[PDB]
Amino acid sequence: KWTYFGPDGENSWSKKYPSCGGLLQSPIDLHSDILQYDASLTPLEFQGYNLSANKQFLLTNNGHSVKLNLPSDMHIQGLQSRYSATQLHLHWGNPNDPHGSEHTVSGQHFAAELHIVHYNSDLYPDASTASNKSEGLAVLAVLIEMGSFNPSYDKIFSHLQHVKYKGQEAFVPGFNIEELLPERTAEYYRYRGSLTTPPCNPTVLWTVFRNPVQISQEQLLALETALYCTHMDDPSPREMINNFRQVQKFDERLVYTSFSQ
Amino acid sequence: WTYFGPDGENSWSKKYPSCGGLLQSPIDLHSDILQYDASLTPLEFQGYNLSANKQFLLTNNGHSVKLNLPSDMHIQGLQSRYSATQLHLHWGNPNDPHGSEHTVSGQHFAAELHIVHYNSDLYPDASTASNKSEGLAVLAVLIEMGSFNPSYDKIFSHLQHVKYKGQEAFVPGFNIEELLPERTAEYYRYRGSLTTPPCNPTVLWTVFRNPVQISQEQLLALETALYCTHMDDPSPREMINNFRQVQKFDERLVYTSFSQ
Numbered sequence: 001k002w003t004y005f006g007p008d009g010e011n012s013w014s015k016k017y018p019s020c021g022g023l024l025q026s027p028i029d030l031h032s033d034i035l036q037y038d039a040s041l042t043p044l045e046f047q048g049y050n051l052s053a054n055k056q057f058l059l060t061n062n063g064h065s066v067k068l069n070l071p072s073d074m075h076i077q078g079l080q081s082r083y084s085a086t087q088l089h090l091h092w093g094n095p096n097d098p099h100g101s102e103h104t105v106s107g108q109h110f111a112a113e114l115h116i117v118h119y120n121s122d123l124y125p126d127a128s129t130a131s132n133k134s135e136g137l138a139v140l141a142v143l144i145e146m147g148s149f150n151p152s153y154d155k156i157f158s159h160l161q162h163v164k165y166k167g168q169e170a171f172v173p174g175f176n177i178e179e180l181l182p183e184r185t186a187e188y189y190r191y192r193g194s195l196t197t198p199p200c201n202p203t204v205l206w207t208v209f210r211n212p213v214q215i216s217q218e219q220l221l222a223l224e225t226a227l228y229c230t231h232m233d234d235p236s237p238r239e240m241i242n243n244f245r246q247v248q249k250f251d252e253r254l255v256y257t258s259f260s261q
Numbered sequence: 262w263t264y265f266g267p268d269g270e271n272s273w274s275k276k277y278p279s280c281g282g283l284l285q286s287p288i289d290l291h292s293d294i295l296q297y298d299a300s301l302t303p304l305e306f307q308g309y310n311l312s313a314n315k316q317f318l319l320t321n322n323g324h325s326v327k328l329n330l331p332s333d334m335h336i337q338g339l340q341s342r343y344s345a346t347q348l349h350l351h352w353g354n355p356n357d358p359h360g361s362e363h364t365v366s367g368q369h370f371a372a373e374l375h376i377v378h379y380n381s382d383l384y385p386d387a388s389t390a391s392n393k394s395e396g397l398a399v400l401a402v403l404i405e406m407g408s409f410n411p412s413y414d415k416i417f418s419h420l421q422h423v424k425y426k427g428q429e430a431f432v433p434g435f436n437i438e439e440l441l442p443e444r445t446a447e448y449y450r451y452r453g454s455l456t457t458p459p460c461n462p463t464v465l466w467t468v469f470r471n472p473v474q475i476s477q478e479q480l481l482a483l484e485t486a487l488y489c490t491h492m493d494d495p496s497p498r499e500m501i502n503n504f505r506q507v508q509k510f511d512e513r514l515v516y517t518s519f520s521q
């Protein structure tokens with residue numbers, strides 16, 4: 001029954017989900033005082049991201065975001081373990097305030113944020129098992145700015161009107177997921193953190209790319225207006241907007257960067 | 262409650278329900294939510310020139326350093342008289358010296374001074390006012406690093422004597438208006454809450470537009486002088502990062518006394 005607004009909003013998550021009040025919480029504000037170059041943060045390699053256009057992948061409204069299920073033959077290499085994809089999802093604001101990224105950079109929110117969730121498939125048989133374990137998850141984050149129309153993100157957004165309500169599912173033809181990534185993926189921030197939603201487990205290695213991507217105002221408006229947190233028959237409908245957590249205290253962490261300037 | 266660890270701000274709402282309710286402060290002050298309001302005329306600070314023949318109690322309460330203020334000190338200009346009760350500060354730490362509560366265009370200032378007042382027309386004391394309608398008014402001064410500030414040193418010169426939780430010192434009266442910035446006629450105004458437990462949504466906030474300056478050495482003293490633990494605690498903890506994160510603030514405006 002957790003939400004991002006009202007009595008069950010983010011200041012209340014810890015009442016039911018103790019880790020939301022614990023250490024290592026995400027998201028965070030990426031600002032100069034807490035950044036440190038780390039020359040060991042070499043490029044990631046994206047393996048299996050080119051999904052076949054003749055296959056299809058399940059898109060679901062889970063009542064909190066829209067998520068696309070991804071095949072476990074999709075993985076990121078370059079980490080000390082291989083991590084296999086499990087799903088991607090987004091966070092966004094609202095039509096009157098299109099400023100709903102989770103991470104901020106030097107105190108500024110971006111329009112929206114894409115997260116590609118992966119689990120340690122060297123160590124664990126599935127993402128749920130990995131999720132409460134040491135080194136379990138790795139999330140890639142792409143900051144999204146209002147800008148030009150993005151045909152690659154539209155491969156997801158063109159299906160919004162078919163997953164309007166909680167529990168609804170649709171199929172999306174495969175496409176190359178690396179088209180959702182920005183320029184210069186070798187430039188990223190890296191830190192230890194958590195899931196940004198309940199249960200807030202502190203088991204996520206975050207990689208936030210330095211450069212944002214653009215999607216148009218019209219794409220953001222569709223994202224911000226198409227979806228409901230509630231089921232199709234709910235007498236108290238709730239729009240799915242502003243589904244981002246506020247930034248969290250650092251608690252002595254640093255954020256390591258693969259770029260020195 | 263604490264500002265860190267398991268009893269930190271995401272857990273306040275367990276014991277202090279209002280911390281998860283409406284009208285929470287602090288917030289980011291940014292151009293999209295600002296609206297000029299011609300009704301926001303200058304405040305008058307009466308009784309702020311405190312007798313130098315009087316002393317005023319400075320305490321480390323384990324959360325901040327607070328100075329008790331007399332009720333004959335009051336703001337004029339609001340519908341009711343609001344009488345002073347105390348002032349205190351929020352700050353960051355030497356590795357990240359950006360610990361204001363309010364942000365401006367997403368940016369923290371170095372520190373923030375708050376002068377708390379209560380509606381003495383309606384209520385007999387601040388504690389009684391704190392959970393009631395129109396109960397509280399806080400004045401907020403944003404602090405940045407710059408020139409040595411003699412006025413802030415009238416407080417900061419006493420910090421050594423309030424190093425540990427529970428410790429107190431007497432401060433001789435001085436003109437509190439000296440702690441306020443230039444052009445106090447320019448301010449942001451909104452209805453919000455206490456930024457600490459119990460987080461009651463009973464605060465009329467006035468955040469002055471213009472910051473004050475203090476020296477690099479004054480800010481480092483604030484950030485390093487105090488612990489949040491008792492003297493005899495075998496596990497001492499420095500008092501740093503004593504600010505709440507900004508809160509969501511949707512479908513609302515912050516009113517400004519300035520348009521330019």
Ligand SMILES: CCOc1c(F)c(S(N)(=O)=O)c(F)c(NC2CCCCCCC2)c1S(=O)(=O)CCCO
Pocket residue numbers: 062064065067086087089090115117127128131139194195196197198199243
């Ligand atoms: C609003 C989106 O919700 C997130 C979420 F924000 C994050 S994040 N931002 O990457 O921390 C998520 F990782 C997930 N998905 C998970 C997939 C791994 C499966 C284990 C349990 C939950 C995490 C999900 S979610 O699966 O969409 C909902 C999980 C509720 O526990």
Ligand SMILES: CCOc1c(F)c(S(N)(=O)=O)c(F)c(NC2CCCCCCC2)c1S(=O)(=O)CCCO
Pocket residue numbers: 322324325327346347349375377387388391399454455456457458459503
């Ligand atoms: C870290 C400083 O704590 C604040 C504080 F942050 C605020 S603020 N930022 O102005 O909201 C406060 F107002 C207070 N003091 C108030 C005095 C009025 C008396 C009744 C309740 C406490 C609030 C205090 S406090 O009195 O120092 C601690 C209150 C714990 O209930």
Ligand SMILES: [Zn+2]
Pocket residue numbers: 089090091115196
């Ligand atoms: Zn996410």
Ligand SMILES: [Zn+2]
Pocket residue numbers: 349350351375456
């Ligand atoms: Zn305060």
